[PDB]
Design a binder for these strands. Sequence first.
RNA 1: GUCAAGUGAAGAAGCGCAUACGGUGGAUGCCUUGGCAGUCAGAGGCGAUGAAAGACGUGGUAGCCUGCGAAAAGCUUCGGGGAGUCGGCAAACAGACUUUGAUCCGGAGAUCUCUGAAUGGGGGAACCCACCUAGGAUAACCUAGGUAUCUUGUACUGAAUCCAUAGGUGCAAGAGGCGAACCAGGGGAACUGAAACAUCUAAGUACCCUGAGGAAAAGAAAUCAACCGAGAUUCCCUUAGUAGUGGCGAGCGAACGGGGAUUAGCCCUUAAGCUUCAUUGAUUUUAGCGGAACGCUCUGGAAAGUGCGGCCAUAGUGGGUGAUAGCCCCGUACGCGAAAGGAUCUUUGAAGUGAAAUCAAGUAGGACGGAGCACGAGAAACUUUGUCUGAACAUGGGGGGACCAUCCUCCAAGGCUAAAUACUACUGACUGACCGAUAGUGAACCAGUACCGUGAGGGAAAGGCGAAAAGAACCCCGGAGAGGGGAGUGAAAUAGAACCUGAAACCGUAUGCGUACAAGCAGUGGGAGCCUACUUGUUAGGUGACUGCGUACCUUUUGUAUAAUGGGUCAGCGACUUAUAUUCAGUGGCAAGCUUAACCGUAUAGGGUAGGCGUAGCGAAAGCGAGUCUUAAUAGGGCGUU
RNA 2: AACCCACUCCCGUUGAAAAGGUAGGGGAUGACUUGUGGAUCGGAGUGAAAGGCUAAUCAAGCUCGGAGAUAGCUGGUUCUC
RNA 3: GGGGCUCAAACCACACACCGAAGCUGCGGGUGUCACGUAAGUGACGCGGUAGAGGAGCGUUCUGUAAGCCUGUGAAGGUGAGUUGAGAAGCUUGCUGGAGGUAUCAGAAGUGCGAAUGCUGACAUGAGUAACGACAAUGGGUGUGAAAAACACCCACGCCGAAAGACCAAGGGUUCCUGCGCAACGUUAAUCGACGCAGGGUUAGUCGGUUCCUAAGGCGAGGCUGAAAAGCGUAGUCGA
RNA 4: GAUGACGAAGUGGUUGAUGCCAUGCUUCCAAGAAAAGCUUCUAAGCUUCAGGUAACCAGGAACCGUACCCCAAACCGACA
RNA 5: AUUAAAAACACAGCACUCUGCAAACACGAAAGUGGACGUAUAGGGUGUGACGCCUGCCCGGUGCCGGAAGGUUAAUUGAUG
RNA 6: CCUUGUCGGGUAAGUUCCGACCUGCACGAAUGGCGUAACGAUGGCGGCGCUGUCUCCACCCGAGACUCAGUGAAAUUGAAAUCGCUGUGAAGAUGCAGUGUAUCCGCGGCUAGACGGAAAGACCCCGUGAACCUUUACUGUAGCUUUGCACUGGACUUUG
Lengths: 117, 149, 44
Amino acid sequence: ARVKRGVIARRRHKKILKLAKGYYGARSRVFRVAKQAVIKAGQYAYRDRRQRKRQFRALWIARINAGARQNGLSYSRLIAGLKKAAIEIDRKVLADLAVNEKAAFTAIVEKAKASLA
Amino acid sequence: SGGGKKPWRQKGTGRARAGTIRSPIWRGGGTTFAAKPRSHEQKLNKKMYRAALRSILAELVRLDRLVVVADFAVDAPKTKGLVAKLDTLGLKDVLIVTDGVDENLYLAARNLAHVDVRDVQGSDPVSLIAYDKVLVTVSAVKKFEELLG
Amino acid sequence: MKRTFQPSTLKRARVHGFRARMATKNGRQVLSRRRAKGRKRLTV
RNA sequence: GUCAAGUGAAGAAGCGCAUACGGUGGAUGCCUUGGCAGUCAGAGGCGAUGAAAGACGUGGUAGCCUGCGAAAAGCUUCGGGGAGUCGGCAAACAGACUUUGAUCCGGAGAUCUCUGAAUGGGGGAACCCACCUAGGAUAACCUAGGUAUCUUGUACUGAAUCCAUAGGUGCAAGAGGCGAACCAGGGGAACUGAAACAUCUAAGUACCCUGAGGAAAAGAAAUCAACCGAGAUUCCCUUAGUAGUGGCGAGCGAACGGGGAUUAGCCCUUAAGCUUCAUUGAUUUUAGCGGAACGCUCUGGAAAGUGCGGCCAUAGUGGGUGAUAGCCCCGUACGCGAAAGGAUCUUUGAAGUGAAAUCAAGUAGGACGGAGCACGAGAAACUUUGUCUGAACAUGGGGGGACCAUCCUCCAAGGCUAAAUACUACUGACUGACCGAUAGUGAACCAGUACCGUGAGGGAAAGGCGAAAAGAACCCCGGAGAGGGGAGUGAAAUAGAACCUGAAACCGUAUGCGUACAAGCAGUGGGAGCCUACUUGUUAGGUGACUGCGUACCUUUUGUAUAAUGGGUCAGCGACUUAUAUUCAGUGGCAAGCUUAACCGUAUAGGGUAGGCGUAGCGAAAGCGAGUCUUAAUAGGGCGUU
RNA sequence: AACCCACUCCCGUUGAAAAGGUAGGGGAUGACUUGUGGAUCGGAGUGAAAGGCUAAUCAAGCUCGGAGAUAGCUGGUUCUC
RNA sequence: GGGGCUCAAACCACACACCGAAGCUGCGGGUGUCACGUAAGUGACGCGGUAGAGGAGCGUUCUGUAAGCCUGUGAAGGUGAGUUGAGAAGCUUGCUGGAGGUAUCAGAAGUGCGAAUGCUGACAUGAGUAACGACAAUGGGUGUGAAAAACACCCACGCCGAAAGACCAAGGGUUCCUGCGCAACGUUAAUCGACGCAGGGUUAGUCGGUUCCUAAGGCGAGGCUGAAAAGCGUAGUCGA
RNA sequence: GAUGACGAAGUGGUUGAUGCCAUGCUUCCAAGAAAAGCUUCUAAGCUUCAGGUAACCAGGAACCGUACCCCAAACCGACA
RNA sequence: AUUAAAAACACAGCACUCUGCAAACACGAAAGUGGACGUAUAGGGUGUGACGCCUGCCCGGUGCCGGAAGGUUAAUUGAUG
RNA sequence: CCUUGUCGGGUAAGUUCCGACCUGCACGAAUGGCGUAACGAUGGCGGCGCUGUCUCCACCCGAGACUCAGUGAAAUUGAAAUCGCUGUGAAGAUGCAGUGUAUCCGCGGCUAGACGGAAAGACCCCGUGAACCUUUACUGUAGCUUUGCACUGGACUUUG
């Protein structure tokens, strides 16, 4: 029972070469370079699901720092209130309030100048 | 056919190592594990064929796929005469199992598209699990108990 | 700079011709191998 | 308005990405006039009556195939067939032939050039030159036969040499050559395995050579067996990987006894049997003939498909007909059929042969040196023999594994014998969990071709329009081009002949977005703007400015971004199989039993339990057995044991 | 000089050429050069001898068989969890 | 590490904060094992991984199920889009295709490719780059032509002239000549050709061969020799 | 620009071969093809016609190669 | 042949040694052939290498040539145990 | 060998050369010794002439290069969006890190790098690989030779 493998091999090359769509040069059009390029793009995609949670955590902190020094307080003095007080509010929405609702972020940094610890 | 000598010298030619034109990698060459005529016959125990038939007949009774008649004989060697007698039983796609296949019963129903006429010795596990009904005569269930009981 | 093939129809027929092949036993089975392969010429 | 400063949207030579079409290329799918492998049969040869294999010729066009041979795609006769034909690539056209029966298909005959064993002599195969006899022909030939060698037989002839031997000559009869394997012999390797190698293995294999046959060889006991018997040979299954054998290494490997397949023994006081004819009936083979039963409807280019209703069946899963047909066609089941041959079987004669003469003498035996028997000369029997020797005679002789005795069983040195068995180049029929154009034969097609070699030898690539050529009249640009734009044809021409499908690399055009102050595996996380569709926006597709992190992949290694290996890319192909023994696990059948092998079989059934393993072990072994060994010691331990 | 050779330079090295060309160079009545036919061949020829030559191949030609030699070595071994 | 830092952005102590991993926690996700659950069902501890062992699968071709089911109201195939699953992969659909396909569940395997300086074909890159074959040498006019550096003729100019001239043997095989042609071939173009297609063309007593004769050498009746094949050779009879 | 008809001088002296005499002569050692055709002699044979030799007359000489290329684009070198 | 043309090889001359002819020798399982239709002033093999002057010493080892005839020694023979 | 020995000559200067000496690592008499006219595409030295060999190149003439027209290759190639430096690193980096430069793209040239291309390193090691040569390696064996017995006889003697 002989079986020819031209129908399965072309559908398997066409999956890996659809995932390579948009890549420069032979990375999107020949299989030996596109197989490696789709493997690499999914190693990076694994890695950077972790760094996305790190790159936003740095960006929140940097805007909270910048919006606290407007009110006469550093980042680390603002966060230090809350092993003593307890806002339980996180860096994600404090950065969103430092930008947008700037008067409700001034109300949080005066509760942290009330802690004094 | 062919491929005695080496296609080129072992070194110096910048070409991959070859030893014949008829290597299995080459498109002229042989199949790597090329077939020969072998047999696919296998061994059932004699007790194990009989116990498997005895397990099939039990389920033909249990699923109402077995229909016993007192005797089954046609007189003329004619397919139309045997279609007309199976239709009295409400019956198509049948296995007819007799004690000995007579000659007119074999000449009828050997053109007929969905029936077979077997004897008891010639009944087999596949052909009485394939047809939607099995007709055995009363002489056939005697011969099935000589063989299996 | 002469080459290895210097043609001569007389030397070709006395070395490789039909009478020459069928004169000797080892060449008389050249002609039967070359006929079992089914060749068009069998004496070249 | 001016002047300062700040800010920066358009402007792409070219590039990237996505999409849309297009080209190149020939993948895939679907297909098949070709392969492959079996089963059952056929017949197992052809050739001096000139083979296998060819060269050249042969046609109205005429190249190459296939037929034929100067009587040349054919001539004469029977037989069949019944309407078309003058073979194919190769469709057309000429000129024709046929119901007063052509073409076509079988049987028989006639012709059958040249080469090739090649055979009158030569020779570089397909050429050259002859001789003899008979007949015919006007300083030229022609027609029909002969003319090879060797063997055997026979007649005539006759050297040295008297006789007659050699030799010579003529007549008959036969042989030679070719063929894929099978068979009996002659000669015989090596790589390799032994983890080196020499004995040994490989292996009496490969190869060369010589014979024979449709089979061959073998074969009718100087054979085995243990005091019971069995009776030719060959073949299969077991005994059994046992006994033996072996640098006791690697390895090699029986027999007795069983189970089967087949079934015959005749003679040297002359036989079965077999060949050749002649006949007696019979059966086959070489070609053929008859051969059942469907309509309407729907979609469609076309119906076999749909829907409904029937019919036939010793014929229902065949081939192909405009899509899938038991009832359209050709078949199939099933019946019939042969002027003339072939072949097998069978009657009953005939000539032969078997056939060597009369039961076996340079034989058996022996000594040297080898070879074989599974057995490496070994305690080496038995068989064969190159050298040298050498018997007995039924009140003999050989074997029974050194040898001797006693028993048992046989008659060597003369032969002939069918079936069971081996093989398949060639035929035919059926078959396939075989292949489907990179596959399957090297070869689906003008293939052992083209091509490469001085040569032996090596050795390709190349299938698909459509149902039907309906193969595109005419018009237009162009060079009475190539190639196109129409029009026709068709269901479809983006089916237009390089023609089904038409992939990927690779190369283009169009459009959207990005890109000319920005450094590196080219992505990924974040992300603005812009552009398309849509609907609401917290979407969908494209592009991705800017920015964080980021040194391919394989292999090999302690470790490779590695300046270590491999890969230009695409598409196809490409590497744990199969057989037989065995062990373990799972899963089953039976169970103190279980299971068969060859083979038989109206055949996956059933029979066949020879054998294999299990139920008991211990010991080297005789043996003893739920028990030996050891020693003078049943005294003391190892192995086994419901 | 022809002819036969092949000492030197350069070019050429993907060449015009798998060993040439151009300019010079050696022998050139002889142990000369050459046509045609023939003879010898693979542990075997042939060799004014270099392991040279035996059809661009020679410390053992070519081809086909043993044969899929052997390879403790190299490289490669294809879907997923 | 750089900018840069001097009561420090250095060093020494101490205090308090903060940032920082795939660690830990929060939250959502299979069964891996195990214990319980009359087996619904939650718990608990795990879950990096090469060689390697174990366990479970997907997809391809074939056979049975299949004279079934689907399909010309459109199969396989090809190209897109959408969707589902832990994955291999599935399902649905637009276009192209124009005749086949194979739910399920079992059976069998030529069953899955990116690498083997793999093998075959196609195609890139190098790159419109190097070259276009002796450095005898070309220049005008005219013709024909769809178009002339290259063809024909004319006028010149150069080159060979012990050949770049005339012949013969060999070897090749129609390449010779004429009419018509230019696709391919010709290292460019070609109207020209050693190219295509069709016709034609090779005349012998004296020229070459055959015939006659022999050399080297080959074969060789018989014969001598050798396991066989065969070797050697006499008479002879081939061989310029 | 082809073809049918006509068509003139055509002698002498020089110099000469690597051609011919010549397969001659001279000389030297290394000492220089076979066989046939041919010329001649007889044998075995013949009627001593046939056979031979001249002369005259009449007729014949088969078959095969021949084109083209050869200091080459046609041969040997994969190639104009 | 295709990176070495030389001092390498060949050579005339020289010497040594074998060879009495069916020669030594060589090719041949063998017949046969070559040597040679030659015959020791000849043929084979070895070494040196025109010529001139010359070619010393060593016979232990190993080879070859000759030698007594003693010891050891093979198949064969087959006494005795 | 020490070594460019030492001395003489030739040069301004001479590891070479010539002639000597003898301290011959390690000449030697047919694997010939020492000379030697002629010869040599032979090896080494020195001189004359001659010169682009050179100081040191200048100009010129033809054939390529360059340009245009036509035809149209090759080795190579994982992919490329393909800088310097100084570090790091399988230990010599276009690609890592840090940092300097740097608009985009050809053409002509030159070859420093890409451990550039070409040939599964030739040296070296390895392999219980191969081949071919050698012998006083092992085991054989053709050939030659010795004797026994055959083919192979009688007849006397020396002789036991």
